Write an enzyme that holds these catalytic residues in place. Structure first.
Site, mmCIF file in Angstrom:
data_model
loop_
_atom_site.group_PDB
_atom_site.id
_atom_site.type_symbol
_atom_site.label_atom_id
_atom_site.label_comp_id
_atom_site.label_asym_id
_atom_site.label_seq_id
_atom_site.Cartn_x
_atom_site.Cartn_y
_atom_site.Cartn_z
ATOM 1 N N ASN A 152 7.230 7.975 -10.177
ATOM 2 C CA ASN A 152 6.767 6.746 -9.661
ATOM 3 C C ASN A 152 5.358 6.873 -9.990
ATOM 4 O O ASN A 152 4.825 7.899 -9.803
ATOM 5 C CB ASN A 152 6.931 6.784 -8.161
ATOM 6 C CG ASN A 152 6.115 5.761 -7.459
ATOM 7 O OD1 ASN A 152 6.249 4.591 -7.667
ATOM 8 N ND2 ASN A 152 5.282 6.207 -6.605
ATOM 9 N N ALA A 153 4.720 5.884 -10.532
ATOM 10 C CA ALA A 153 3.270 5.945 -10.487
ATOM 11 C C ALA A 153 3.017 4.570 -10.070
ATOM 12 O O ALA A 153 3.524 3.650 -10.647
ATOM 13 C CB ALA A 153 2.589 6.276 -11.806
ATOM 14 N N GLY A 154 2.308 4.457 -8.987
ATOM 15 C CA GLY A 154 2.583 3.439 -8.048
ATOM 16 C C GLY A 154 1.698 2.256 -8.078
ATOM 17 O O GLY A 154 2.015 1.250 -8.660
ATOM 18 N N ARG A 158 -0.694 6.216 -2.221
ATOM 19 C CA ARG A 158 -0.211 5.253 -1.246
ATOM 20 C C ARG A 158 1.012 4.516 -1.754
ATOM 21 O O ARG A 158 1.500 4.790 -2.862
ATOM 22 C CB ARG A 158 -1.303 4.267 -0.800
ATOM 23 C CG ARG A 158 -2.246 3.789 -1.886
ATOM 24 C CD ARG A 158 -3.658 3.629 -1.305
ATOM 25 N NE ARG A 158 -4.544 2.851 -2.186
ATOM 26 C CZ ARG A 158 -5.461 3.353 -3.029
ATOM 27 N NH1 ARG A 158 -5.652 4.670 -3.143
ATOM 28 N NH2 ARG A 158 -6.204 2.524 -3.769
ATOM 29 N N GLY A 159 1.501 3.586 -0.931
ATOM 30 C CA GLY A 159 2.721 2.837 -1.233
ATOM 31 C C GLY A 159 3.943 3.719 -1.095
ATOM 32 O O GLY A 159 3.933 4.648 -0.287
ATOM 33 N N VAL A 195 -1.319 10.550 -15.527
ATOM 34 C CA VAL A 195 -0.069 11.030 -16.088
ATOM 35 C C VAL A 195 0.235 10.482 -17.514
ATOM 36 O O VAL A 195 1.184 10.906 -18.175
ATOM 37 C CB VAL A 195 1.130 10.836 -15.051
ATOM 38 C CG1 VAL A 195 0.966 11.719 -13.827
ATOM 39 C CG2 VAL A 195 1.241 9.400 -14.590
ATOM 40 N N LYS A 243 11.778 -1.460 -17.103
ATOM 41 C CA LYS A 243 12.834 -1.259 -16.111
ATOM 42 C C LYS A 243 14.176 -0.948 -16.800
ATOM 43 O O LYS A 243 14.844 0.005 -16.394
ATOM 44 C CB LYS A 243 12.908 -2.463 -15.175
ATOM 45 C CG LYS A 243 13.819 -2.363 -13.965
ATOM 46 C CD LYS A 243 13.650 -3.702 -13.187
ATOM 47 C CE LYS A 243 14.392 -3.738 -11.836
ATOM 48 N NZ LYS A 243 15.634 -2.921 -11.871
ATOM 49 N N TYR A 282 7.491 -5.517 -18.082
ATOM 50 C CA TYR A 282 8.076 -4.741 -16.973
ATOM 51 C C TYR A 282 9.585 -4.714 -17.038
ATOM 52 O O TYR A 282 10.213 -3.715 -16.674
ATOM 53 C CB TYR A 282 7.670 -5.282 -15.577
ATOM 54 C CG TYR A 282 6.287 -4.921 -15.154
ATOM 55 C CD1 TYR A 282 6.005 -3.704 -14.483
ATOM 56 C CD2 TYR A 282 5.231 -5.789 -15.433
ATOM 57 C CE1 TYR A 282 4.659 -3.367 -14.094
ATOM 58 C CE2 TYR A 282 3.893 -5.485 -15.054
ATOM 59 C CZ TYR A 282 3.611 -4.287 -14.405
ATOM 60 O OH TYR A 282 2.288 -4.071 -14.104
#
Lengths: 364, 362
Positions: free
Chosen positions: B253-255, B181-182, B226, B303, B299
């Protein structure tokens, strides 16, 4: 109300811890030991050498160093992480980790006490093991002079440096040209340069009149009424240098001053470029020279980007002649104050900042 | 509301004025004349490649001042310049580098929804500038609705257009992590709309949510952590069973379905996957890696890290005919589809000349 620089006050509000592994920790410990209260319980500065981190997994080193100590960091404290130029890493793993540093230092600030700052300094992997070229940056960062420079990235290259005779008078004997010098940041830059022992040539427009004469005198410098956008400006500055300063200047500060598309381009971009190209081209600014740009909507945003363009484009050609070019891009000022902008400029102007070129820093 | 992409509806809502002077104005005209309405304005493109001196920047103002007011809503403004580090003179570097200040401030005098973009093109790009075209088409469309004030860097390489610009990813095999999702799930959807066969990856406990993504998109589901060591192998195994051992595109992306943790999930795992899948021949000639950051010290680091991956790996990946780029999103939920579109732009086989780029979606 934030700490600005004074007199024979100590550089930090308390002790100075230097940690991490890598090629910078020992040279810095030896270099900063005499003037700072160095440690092996209420901190004025925190320095982490990140040069030894060669893989992303090693980034936990940052967490491990800072977590036990951040809380004891004082008001108006300094945090500096020192890494190696990511473009120049020996592995892609190392480039990633050193690039990641920028994220850490820029978000750490939100956890700090009032007035405390963070900074990221990259050093060429080709800098020699004493890391002399780094010293002027560290001293600037680890002092009150850098009160409003926060979350910035400094890029130091490979050359060696020589301390000034006196780090409290680093501009002792140098000749500085400052444009837009009658009022405003210009007047302040002139004042800070004089404080640091420079001889200031104060340049502004003819209608600045008495104000310019006043600034010149207050700073013990000379006044040169001149329109920097005129054809003969370079020639007129040179002539003034011949009369008052044996034909030579060390420092050129391109500040537009507060004293339509074409007018804005001419004053904030074309003129300073011309000044720089001419004064360098004729030898008025030679080996050891410093050019420092100061920016300040579509008009101005273009010239502000233009100024970044000059600073990046001219750096290689200028370094081959022994000259550095840097720029400061100030925020909201009339909070942040002019002296703060002036210090940043004076940091670049330092004879000990010869390994700092092609940089652009924001103030406030 | 703000317009997104649908049907065989024309890409702009007004005509396209391509002006300026330089090496891009003619080839861009000839490339776009069929699909667009050329020369109540849907799009404004100014070729800034012939500005070789700062004094020449007046041409930007000269071009824009009469026409901005006539620019329609959700219009697109694009300035195309020459890579400044590669200019032939310092004067030129300075004038091209300055385009960035102009392009970012211009947005501020535009109508709502209208956007600005700066594209830099390598001076060693052939005259036809075919490597430019997918960037142009993405920008001159409703797909880029929330990509504003951004800088694209396009290499020297030529491009081949996809058979159909509306199914750009036809026959392609795309791995999308965090897809239950997302944004992951929406990325999966935009990819399938564009014709890709999607491998939807996500953790065990997404359970049937992953099933639905895979199911909605005509793809397959792979339940996997992952960050686990076996992750590269299980993915490879999957590709061997369902796609003849190859994937074309990898989306990192791992969301959405303690320092150490944020690093593993957000920096280490996507690096592992990239290095594992390229290194075992799972992704080759024509490959696409696309990273997606989070929406804060740990984060922030990961990033910055992602930007590093993107910049560090690009040279070595180019030599293998694989591009790597990234999207830095948020604050969002703005819409997911808008981030997904940006990912799909990089994914495109026609974006081979686009590498080492980082684009914010807002």
């Amino acid at each position: 109300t934030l700490r600005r620089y004074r007199a024979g006050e100590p550089p930090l509000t308390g002790s100075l811890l230097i940690g991490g592994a890598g090629r910078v920790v020992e040279p810095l410990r030896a270099a900063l030991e005499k003037d700072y209260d160095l440690v092996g319980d209420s901190f004025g500065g925190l320095v982490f050498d990140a040069t030894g981190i060669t893989e992303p997994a090693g980034l936990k080193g940052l967490h491990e160093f800072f977590t036990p100590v951040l809380r004891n960091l004082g008001r108006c404290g300094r945090v500096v992480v020192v890494g190696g130029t990511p473009e120049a890493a020996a592995s892609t793993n190392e480039r990633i980790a050193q690039r990641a540093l920028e994220g850490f230092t820029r978000s750490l600030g939100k956890e700090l006490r009032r007035g405390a700052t963070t900074a990221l300094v990259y050093l060429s992997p080709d800098a020699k093991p004493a890391a002399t070229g780094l010293e002027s940056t560290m001293r600037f960062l680890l002092s009150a002079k850098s009160a409003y420079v926060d979350g910035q990235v400094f890029s130091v290259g490979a050359d060696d440096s020589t301390p000034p005779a006196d780090w409290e008078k680093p501009l002792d004997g140098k000749v500085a040209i400052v444009t837009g010098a009658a009022r405003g940041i210009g007047a302040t830059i002139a004042e800070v340069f004089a404080r640091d022992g420079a001889h200031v040539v104060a340049i502004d427009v003819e209608s600045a009149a008495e104000n310019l004469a006043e600034t010149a005198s207050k700073v013990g410098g000379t006044a040169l009424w001149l329109d920097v956008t005129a054809d003969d400006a370079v020639d007129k500055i040179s002539e003034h240098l011949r009369d008052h300063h044996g034909g030579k200047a060390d420092i050129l500060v391109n500040n537009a001053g507060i004293t339509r598309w074409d007018a804005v381009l001419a004053v904030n971009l074309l003129a300073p470029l011309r000044l720089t190209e001419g004064l360098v081209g004729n030898g008025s600014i030679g080996e050891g020279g410093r050019v420092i740009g100061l920016s300040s909507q579509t008009n101005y945003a273009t010239t502000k980007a233009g100024m970044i363009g000059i600073t990046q484009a001219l750096a290689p050609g200028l370094a081959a002649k022994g000259i550095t070019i840097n720029a400061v891009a100030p925020g909201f000022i009339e909070g942040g104050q002019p002296v703060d902008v002036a210090e940043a400029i004076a940091y670049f102007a330092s004879p000990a900042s010869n390994a700092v070129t092609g940089n652009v820093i924001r103030v406030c």
